[PDB]
Design a protein around this ligand. Structure first.
Ligand code: HEM
Ligand code: HEM
Ligand SMILES: O=C(CCCCCn1ccnc1)N[C@@H](Cc1ccccc1)C(=O)O
Ligand SMILES: O=C(CCCCCn1ccnc1)N[C@@H](Cc1ccccc1)C(=O)O
Ligand SMILES: C=Cc1ccccc1
Ligand SMILES: C=Cc1ccccc1
Ligand SMILES: C=Cc1ccccc1
Lengths: 436, 444
């Protein structure tokens, strides 16, 4: 009945616990000590961190809880506006934009994105096959090049041309600094950086003046409910939203996937063997990517251990009781600590920290709400299928074309922004000399 | 593009008289030894291809290219199992409903509710064995069938077959075990007495199920999920006709293949004393209470490996059938047209030396220490894909609980030096397998 709570810092309460460069991993350690639920207090704020499937499946009851904007999302809202990810469910523009943009993430839409995904994936393979002997790969940096370019091309027919650069694009230079101010919360840079983004979004809009992409549905798509299309201001927020949401969590997944592969050679061989027998053409087709089952299992197990969007927030729609012993009042917050939920020994067994993609051969074997890397309910990730198709294509192409070596025997160091990434992860790729 | 081998033919009967034998799975295994990874098998009105290598079977398990086919054996079982889960086609509406309605009752979480009743039946087995007089022996497959039938009856439907109080098995299964016999005999096959008996058999099995369905305060069991469960997709519950078919289906599928596994597991243990001692040592240090708990059974890792290795050599459901959803090519050299059949010869697949090495015939549970070490689709005792065994974990929990309790409570002796004689129905079992058990005098 009484909720545990970590150590306090006087009038600052629990807030200095987050004054660290790895806040998610610190919260995981607290969850290891205090268990499935603990209170977290800050000046002006109270929330509860859930970490067990037993409590989180109740929090995922959409009749009792709705998506809440965490403090991290409130700061992203200062430039993402009422885009899909930083709007409340009751805001008119959420459901409107939701109804207009859901078709562009359908299976018929994924078939149309596929050619442009392969375009960027080929650029990645050719960069690696053009390396000299004893040169290494900076994995998360190259994966960020790929995912940013994919969403730019597939979504808006804009070429960031990240593989022609050392220093990333001027647009995201503002982003990582603007997102830095958001996570760290200099105010001059934030305002000057926010303008830089709107200036790109203008170039992307003016240039569209054909195509079958996200940007088309935003200018021409009409919400069946209200009959209205999106107004100019909201489209600009969606572009910013999709540029951000569309790349960084996907590049973390690919980076973590390759990390776990080179640390588990038995899993690597099974995935490489599948890639070899399935990807028989010089360019993978859409149907061939759907056939990479074990590769998809690899990606899901990487998302289990290190889900790159590591939390989401909920609030109680009415007075209710959680787990039969924790009464909540209307408006109270919850935080779903996804990495801890995915380490629930009562769901996954004792080998939670081991990388075994074989857990995911049967999706029906996994209990309800035990696996939530993409959020929950109507506010779940709209880009899930985009993300998994791109990552499966790219990982399959990587496994087909190269043998990989953990030549520094890398020690996992997870850098935390609002997402997770293995920092300093480097490998060597020995080409298999299979032409494209 | 290669031409497919084929065994000897019998004129207009083609290959069919090859199955006119009392050990057809072992006969098909011998043909696979002669002809290799694939061979065509023809019968009047029927053609299928038997796969035996991981190389081809890993392709056949691609669900975008192949779907479950009802073999001639499953078609005959359908005459009384109806559109139950095991004898329905994937596109039949009642498959996906019953599948969506019944998966929760087979979840790893769900076993915790079955566990007490599994222990109920397992204690009766231990107490029967410690109550034997000196120099009395155990009839292993007979007692394992007593246990598994009672477990599925109790855990699934709160019905007590009370097999450990009987010499002659239950009247229901006498019809059931005879119905599977007549169905099996029809493949190899004036027969009016066979058809009169068959319908009378369906009547005994049905009327018993309608006793419970008509008879049945709620419960944890399967039957509760069937009467109250609603398909999340269509919102509909099962109709009464399908429910009875599921009961018949689960009564059959729930016990017969599981008792063969336990029988084969105990056979291999007493033929490999070093493995038995290693398994017995784990049982002792883990089963520290008079009654095993759910957690402790989960901790019997080596026992689970023992059961997996028994399933490798003699998978008690020895085959399953597939059909090509579209024109495709198997292995780059065998073209298949839409609708063509395959048969997966599971015991032969599990003897692929390119997967397991040259010691394929040796009982070594350590092969299953790492699941990530096993190549894809090399181990298929429970079928494939969405049409895989729904009761897989029920079976493995029951067998692990029962086998661990046996190894904790008795030392076993192969006092006749039993020669393995595998009886074939639609499943496999070691016939005539008998042992002596010296109680260790550990109370319950
Ligand atoms: C690759 C791995 C990805 C992960 C782990 C991930 C994670 C998540 C999570 C957890 C949420 C729910 C956040 C919340 O409930 O507060 C979410 C929402 C969202 N994601 Fe992703 N995402 C991924 C890929 C993508 C991609 C590729 C796109 C764009 C194409 C995208 C666009 C969005 C959008 C628009 C939302 C908001 C949906 C809504 O509010 O209705 N995501 N994502
Ligand atoms: C060691 C024990 C067992 C083995 C080796 C085994 C084997 C198999 C195999 C190979 C299949 C696929 C058949 C096919 O594809 O045609 C299957 C399906 C099935 N099994 Fe089992 N089984 C076992 C135990 C059980 C138990 C205990 C139950 C019931 C609780 C059960 C119920 C079923 C059902 C209902 C199906 C059909 C599932 C569907 O098609 O959706 N089995 N089993
Ligand atoms: O735990 C987290 C991390 C959640 C960020 C996920 C962002 N993302 C990115 C893509 N899709 C979602 N954030 C808390 C920290 C906090 C708690 C209490 C008081 C102050 C701060 C919060 O911001 O509320
Ligand atoms: O022998 C078998 C073995 C099938 C038994 C599997 C039944 N089971 C029981 C529980 N789980 C599965 N299958 C073929 C034989 C045949 C080949 C060619 C022509 C006619 C018959 C078939 O029945 O089609
Ligand atoms: C709170 C920030 C905001 C952003 C866009 C529209 C309305 C409000
Ligand atoms: C979840 C929907 C909602 C709608 C209006 C107010 C609060 C919540
Ligand atoms: C990280 C810098 C860089 C520079 C050139 C090619 C690839 C990477």
């Amino acid at each position: 009945k009484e909720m545990p709570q970590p150590k306090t810092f006087g009038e600052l309460k629990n807030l200095p616990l987050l004054n660290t460069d790895k806040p998610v991993q610190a919260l995981m350690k607290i969850a290891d000590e205090l268990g499935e639920i603990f209170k977290f207090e800050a000046p002006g704020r109270v929330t509860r961190y859930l970490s067990s499937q037993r409590l989180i499946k109740e929090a995922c009851d959409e009749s009792r809880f709705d998506k809440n904007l965490s403090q991290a999302l409130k700061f992203v809202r200062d430039f993402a506006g009422d885009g899909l990810k930083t709007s409340w469910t009751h805001e008119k523009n959420w459901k409107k934009a939701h109804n207009i943009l859901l078709p562009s993430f359908s299976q018929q839409a994924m078939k149309g994105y596929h050619a442009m995904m392969v375009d960027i994936a080929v650029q990645l393979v050719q960069k690696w096959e053009r390396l000299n002997a004893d040169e290494h790969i900076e994995v998360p940096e190259d994966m960020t090049r790929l995912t940013l370019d994919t969403i730019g091309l597939c979504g808006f027919n804009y070429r960031f041309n990240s593989f022609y650069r050392d220093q990333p694009h001027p647009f995201i230079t503002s982003m990582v600094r603007a997102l830095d101010e958001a996570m760290n919360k200099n105010k001059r840079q934030f305002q000057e950086d926010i303008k830089v983004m709107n200036d790109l979004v203008d170039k992307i809009i003016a240039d569209r003046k054909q195509s079958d992409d996200l940007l088309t549905h935003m200018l021409n798509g009409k919400d069946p409910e209200t009959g209205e299309p999106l107004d100019d201001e909201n489209i600009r927020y969606q572009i910013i939203t999709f540029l951000i949401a569309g790349h960084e969590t996907t590049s973390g997944l690919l980076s973590f996937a390759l990390y776990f592969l080179v640390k588990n050679p038995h899993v690597l061989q099974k995935a490489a063997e599948e890639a070899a027998r399935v990807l028989v053409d010089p360019v993978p087709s859409y149907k061939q990517v759907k056939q990479l089952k074990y590769v998809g299992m690899v990606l899901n197990e990487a998302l289990r251990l290190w889900p790159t969007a590591p939390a989401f927030s909920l609030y109680a729609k009415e007075d209710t009781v959680l787990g039969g012993e924790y009464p909540l009042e209307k408006g109270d917050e919850l935080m779903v600590l996804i990495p801890q939920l995915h380490r629930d020994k009562t769901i996954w067994g004792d080998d939670v920290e081991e990388f075994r993609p074989e857990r995911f051969e049967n999706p029906s074997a996994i209990p309800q709400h035990a696996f939530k890397p993409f959020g929950n309910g109507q506010r779940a990730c709209i880009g899930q299928q985009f993300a998994l198709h791109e990552a499966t294509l790219v990982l399959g192409m990587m496994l087909k074309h190269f043998d990989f070596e953990d030549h520094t025997n890398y020690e996992l160091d997870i850098k935390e922004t609002l997402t997770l990434k293995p920092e300093g992860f480097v490998v060597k790729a020995k080409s298999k000399k299979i032409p494209l």
